[PDB]
From Swiss-Prot, chains A, B:
Main location, first listed in the record: periplasm
Subunit field text: Homodimer.
Assigned protein family: Belongs to the high-potential iron-sulfur protein (HiPIP) family.
Example GO biological process: aerobic electron transport chain
Origin organism lineage: Bacteria, Pseudomonadati, Pseudomonadota, Gammaproteobacteria, Chromatiales
Localization, UniProt: Periplasm
Statement: the UniProt record of this protein carries the keyword Cell inner membrane: no
MF term (GO), any: 4 iron, 4 sulfur cluster binding
Gene source species: Marichromatium purpuratum (Chromatium purpuratum)
Name of the protein described by the UniProt record: High-potential iron-sulfur protein
Taxonomic superkingdom: Bacteria
Function in brief: Specific class of high-redox-potential 4Fe-4S ferredoxins. Functions in anaerobic electron transport in most purple and in some other photosynthetic bacteria and in at least one genus (Paracoccus) of halophilic, denitrifying bacteria.
Keywords from the UniProt entry: 4Fe-4S, Electron transport, Iron, Iron-sulfur, Metal-binding, Periplasm, Transport
GO cellular component: periplasmic space
Residue sites binding [4Fe-4S] cluster per the record: C42, C45, C60, C74
């Protein structure tokens, strides 16, 4: 929707395996540590920028100037510190 | 040197912990799998774009339009497939 939203065809997105819907991602296979794969989303990711965008479209450290979907996922998923 | 070279102060670089010289990085601590930390550099990283730039300054999938140093390192280090 937002013109600056990261596309799944964007080369950097493809490299990272980003998907607007975490259900379409290889997260169960990646088996990244921190939380069960099913629980892994941009919403609880360390690199997500909540002070960026509006609504479901917040920002991400790996995609400067662009917006990821809070329900998405990518291979760099890291549980938000706290 | 190249105007498009990724700076260590660049926000995305800081997030990823990128360092022009892999010796200045937290690679021994990160203990990423694939090759001994000492052996980890952009030169043997999966996301490095060799067909981009010239000399020591080649490209990287995580830094679109920018150039990383082949001797560098960042937390996303992944041994080049092959
Ligand atoms: S690093 Fe995190 S916030 Fe960014 S696209 Fe990936 S899963 Fe989402
Ligand atoms: S992902 Fe690889 S090529 Fe890119 S800055 Fe990092 S260590 Fe270097």
């Amino acid at each position: 929707v937002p013109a600056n939203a990261v596309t799944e065809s964007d080369p950097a997105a493809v490299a990272l395996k980003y998907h607007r819907d975490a259900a379409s991602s290889e997260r169960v296979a990646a088996a990244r540590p921190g939380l069960p794969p099913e629980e892994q989303h941009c919403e609880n990711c360390q690199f997500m920028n909540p002070d960026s965008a509006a609504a479901d479209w917040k920002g991400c450290q790996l995609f400067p100037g662009k917006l990821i979907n809070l329900s998405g996922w990518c291979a760099s998923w890291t549980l938000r510190a706290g």
